[PDB]
Write a protein that binds this ligand. Structure first.
Ligand SMILES: CO[C@H](c1c(NC(=O)Nc2cnc(-n3nccn3)c(Cl)c2)cnc2cc(Cl)nn12)[C@@H](C)OC
Length: 358
């Protein structure tokens, strides 16, 4: 492999269509599995049409001679007269092609590349380019785990075979057999595999030497800067209360913010630091921010990974941020024998985190 580059899109929260649950776990777990295989992974949740189109265009552009690419989409799919389409979260009801991404157009652009390997996997709820196309239609079918999280049928079987040092086409055929044995998808057309692979190529194949090929190092630096998290900060308030702001990442466009009281003077009986007044573009609803647990924000991956007794806020639209992430830390405090709640607030700039750097 000249390089190993992957783009994973998972669409769950649809405006005019039924919401999905499985993409979250699927995208997250496939990201980890591909990271283990030395892929530079971009993982994005809930993308609009324009966001999808730009992400796909940028991923396609990386597909230079000998590069190993992998594109995964989990979400609603649409079929109209032999063509399949990927449905963005902002798509109107009923479905219409102009609002969707045509799969056949992507395949056509992939066909022009001189990639060492190009794996295009769809997990939808309805000279050679070495393209392996997997098209799963059992996505809303999912299984509930002992964790309480929803895992997709396709991903359940894919997770178990991805790390195998075997030709990708052989790997995917075993996944199709597993689904065929699975009682939910038994005698049904759940996975279609299309392949134009003339060479024994696997996702486990090594990346070309950095002592002569510097494009992997350049793309590694460019990937790294798109995954930068703000360093944790401490804010001091006039009353004497010291607050810590902590940051965790779930996906390339999803960040969890948490606040905790590091010092509370004896005179203050009860205090809480609430993060508010986020940029409009991010579309955060205050009724889904400052939660007592990360689970209540929709963050189930990174859960006992975070400090206890904090307030948690999930920023899942970082790709929409077109300025610095400037928000307010509002402190609400109470003196034991005093009338009510005293409020104090200070603005914070955490720059352009993660995908917002690009
Ligand atoms: C070329 O850039 C890299 C890249 C991708 N680029 C994007 O996703 N671009 C993107 C552009 N615009 C938007 N968008 N925001 C608002 C409106 N449109 C969005 Cl959601 C995404 C996609 N796939 C991979 C895989 C690897 Cl490795 N890198 N890579 C990387 C450095 O990106 C992290």
């Amino acid at each position: 492999a000249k390089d190993k580059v992957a783009l994973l899109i998972g669409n769950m929260n649809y405006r005019e269509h039924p919401k999905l649950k499985a993409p979250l776990v699927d995208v997250y777990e496939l990201t980890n599995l591909l990271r283990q295989l030395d892929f530079k992974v971009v993982s994005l949740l809930d993308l609009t049409e324009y966001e999808m189109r730009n992400a796909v265009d940028e991923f396609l552009l990386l597909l230079d001679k000998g590069v190993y690419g992998l594109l995964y989409y989990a979400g609603h799919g649409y079929e109209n007269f032999g063509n399949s389409f990927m449905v963005p979260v902002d798509a109107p009801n009923p479905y219409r092609s102009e609002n969707c991404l045509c799969v056949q157009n992507i395949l056509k652009l992939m066909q022009e590349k001189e990639t060492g390997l190009n794996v295009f996997l769809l997990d939808m709820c309805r000279v050679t380019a070495n393209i392996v196309f997997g098209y799963a239609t059992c996505q809303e079918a999912f299984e509930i785990q002992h964790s309480g999280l929803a895992n997709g049928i396709f991903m359940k079987f894919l997770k178990d075979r991805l790390l195998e040092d075997k030709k990708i086409t052989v790997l995917l055929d075993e996944v199709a057999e597993d689904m065929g044995k699975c009682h939910l998808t038994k005698g049904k057309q759940a996975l279609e595999i299309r392949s134009s692979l003339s060479e024994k190529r696997a996702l486990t194949d090594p990346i070309q030497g950095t002592e002569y090929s510097a494009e992997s190092l350049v793309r590694n630096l460019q990937w790294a800067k798109a995954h930068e998290l703000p360093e944790s900060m401490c804010l001091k308030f006039d009353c004497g209360v010291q607050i810590q702001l902590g940051f965790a990442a779930e996906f390339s466009n999803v960040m969890i913010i948490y606040t905790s009281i590091v010092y509370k003077p004896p005179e203050i009986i009860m205090c809480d630091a609430y993060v508010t007044d986020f940029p409009l573009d991010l579309d955060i609803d205050p009724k889904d921010a400052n939660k007592g647990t990360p689970e209540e924000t929709g963050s189930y991956l990174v859960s006992k990974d975070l400090p206890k007794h904090c307030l948690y806020t999930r920023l899942s639209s970082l790709q929409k941020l077109k300025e610095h992430l400037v928000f307010t830390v509002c402190l609400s405090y109470q003196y034991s024998g005093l009338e009510d709640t005293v409020e104090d607030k200070q603005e914070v700039n955490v720059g352009k985190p993660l995908i917002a750097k690009l």
